[PDB]
Design a protein around this ligand. Structure first.
Ligand SMILES: [Zn+2]
Length: 148
């Protein structure tokens, strides 16, 4: 299953306007898929441990999660994706803290690539753009399993 803490990350990424009272009840309807990644290929695995990509699906919207390194710390990034692969919705972090989540929201995706220029000297901004593009690529690749 998904713990309530993780549901809050997923629903935030997806822009699911909800009350905390309903979070666990609504969250039972989230579909979750875990993937290894080997040279661009995402294979289903049974649980989140060792996962390189986690894809959530709820009320016709996607969110992807991936491990990320943010100023030297191991963390996870979540990002919501519209099911036409044209926009991201919201991003958030577990395990680190960055103002960049205010940048990486409501952006266009053009053929699997975010429409944004980042400061090339900011390791965290490069990491966010790299991670979000990696996630969009993965979610598009496995989408035939969901809403194609
Ligand atoms: Zn968290």
């Amino acid at each position: 299953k998904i713990d309530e803490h993780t549901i809050g990350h997923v629903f935030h990424a997806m822009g699911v306007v909800h009350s905390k009272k309903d979070r666990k009840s609504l969250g039972k309807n989230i579909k979750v898929f875990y993937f290894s990644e080997e040279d661009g290929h995402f294979q289903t695995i049974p649980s989140k441990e060792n996962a390189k990509l986690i894809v959530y699906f709820y009320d016709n919207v996607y969110a992807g999660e991936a491990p990320i390194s943010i100023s030297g710390k191991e963390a996870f990034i979540f990002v919501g994706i519209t099911p036409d692969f044209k926009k991201i919705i919201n991003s958030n972090l577990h395990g680190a803290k960055s103002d960049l989540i205010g940048t990486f929201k409501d952006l266009n995706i053009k053929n699997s690539k975010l429409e944004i220029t980042v400061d090339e000297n900011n390791s965290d901004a490069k990491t966010f753009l790299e991670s979000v593009n990696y996630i969009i690529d993965g979610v598009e690749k496995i989408s035939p399993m969901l809403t194609n």
